């Protein structure tokens, strides 16, 4: 209901109040209580200040200002994320009397080793730098009872995972772990069973991965859209493709326009019959027509191979929708291509979504490598 219902320090609640949060978003309602009891957490949820606070709030609750040692280590892959995180930390922990230091690859080692001479309670840093300072004995983690990984999936890749495990060596044998991620698959479970203890798993997203899928956006005016789509049909090697629109009307009109140009295609949407929907679905899976235009695919069937190109004719408003449209279910690196058509009023939704799902939607290049949407 409210943050006050979580029985937190006065100063922490003050911090939240000044920060302007009124009611806890669901990730906070789920994680904040479980975290403040000591239990480990493995959560999947979209990125945001909401989630960052969903773990920063417990951190500020646990750490004792009176003890001048590192009591919480917050690992992040990129420096900008260390910045944003530490910013949320300083904000919410405004009245808590708690020092938060950032230590990354972009910074100077000398200034960081110098900074660590003074009191630091919550350390926020990237794998390399943190392991460096840890090995150096510059950063004392003997009383660091709390370990956190935001965008954890980015740091459990082949190389980083080693560094993470080497950092974890310094932490006390008995320590709390909080692992957060946007994108579903986890590289290893040996890591999990070894380094986590009775973790309370949270999952607030569909089980879909953008792994292997190369994402591009293209700023295209509303009137210029069809021309652009044709240019893509002409310039891209497609065995089969799916187009997405934000309205049934636009779906039908676009499908009919595509058939009018000279490409055989089917269409589906919610306002269509269920039986007819699944019918067109299977018919498309067969490969009768080389394209489909659809508003919704509530029905989920794993990982259709044939499709190699996905296009958002209309950019979605929310990251859930975008994920449902682009995300494939196969845990393994499903190979695909996604092209988004960016309206003037979608420029923000692109920034937001790109951020929430923790993925990269780069500007569409003239020369798209054929290795990315066919093999």
């Amino acid at each position: 209901n409210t943050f006050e219902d979580f029985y937190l320090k006065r100063e922490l609640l003050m911090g939240i109040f000044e920060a302007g949060f009124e009611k806890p978003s669901p990730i906070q309602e789920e994680a904040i209580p479980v975290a403040i009891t000591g239990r480990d957490i493995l959560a999947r949820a979209k990125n945001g200040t909401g989630k960052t606070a969903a773990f920063v709030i417990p951190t500020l609750e646990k750490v004792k200002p009176k003890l001048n040692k590192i009591q919480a280590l917050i690992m992040v892959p990129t420096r900008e994320l260390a910045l944003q995180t530490s910013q949320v930390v300083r904000t919410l922990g405004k009245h808590c009397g708690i020092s938060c230091m950032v230590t990354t690859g972009g910074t100077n080692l000398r200034d960081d080793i110098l900074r660590l001479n003074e009191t630091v309670h919550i350390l926020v840093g990237t794998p390399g730098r943190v392991l460096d300072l840890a090995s150096r004995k510059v950063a004392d983690l003997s009383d660091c009872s709390l370990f956190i990984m935001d965008e954890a999936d980015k740091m459990l890749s082949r190389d980083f995972k080693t560094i993470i495990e080497q950092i974890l060596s310094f932490l006390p044998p008995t320590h709390q772990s909080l692992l957060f991620s946007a994108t579903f698959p986890l590289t290893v479970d040996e890591f999990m069973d070894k380094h986590l203890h009775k973790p309370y798993e949270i999952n607030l997203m569909e089980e879909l991965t953008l792994k292997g899928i190369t994402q591009y956006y293209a700023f295209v005016e509303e009137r210029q859209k069809l021309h652009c789509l044709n240019t893509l049909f002409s310039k891209l090697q497609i065995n089969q493709a799916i187009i997405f629109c934000n309205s049934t009307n636009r779906v039908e009109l676009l499908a009919k326009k595509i058939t009018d140009l000279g490409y055989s295609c089917y269409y589906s949407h919610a306002r269509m019959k269920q039986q007819e929907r699944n019918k067109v679905f299977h018919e498309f899976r067969q490969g009768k027509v080389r394209t489909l235009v659809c508003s919704d695919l509530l029905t989920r069937g794993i990982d259709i191979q044939a499709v190699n190109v996905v296009i958002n004719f209309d950019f979605p408003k929310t990251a859930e929708t975008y994920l449902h449209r682009i995300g494939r279910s196969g845990r393994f690196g499903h190979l695909g291509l996604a092209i988004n058509l960016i309206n003037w009023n979608d420029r923000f939704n692109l920034y937001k979504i790109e951020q929430e799902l923790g993925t990269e939607i780069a500007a569409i290049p003239a020369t798209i490598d054929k290795s990315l949407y066919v093999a």
Partner: peptide, 29 residues
């Protein structure tokens, strides 16, 4: 309702192929 269809009648179907790079500069307005 929809605006594009009048905008891009299928039948003429002719233009110098759409250039993305030029519109990517119009990203800021």
């Amino acid at each position: 309702h929809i605006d594009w269809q009048d905008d891009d009648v299928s039948k003429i179907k002719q233009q110098e192929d759409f250039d993305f790079q030029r519109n990517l500069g119009m990203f800021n307005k």
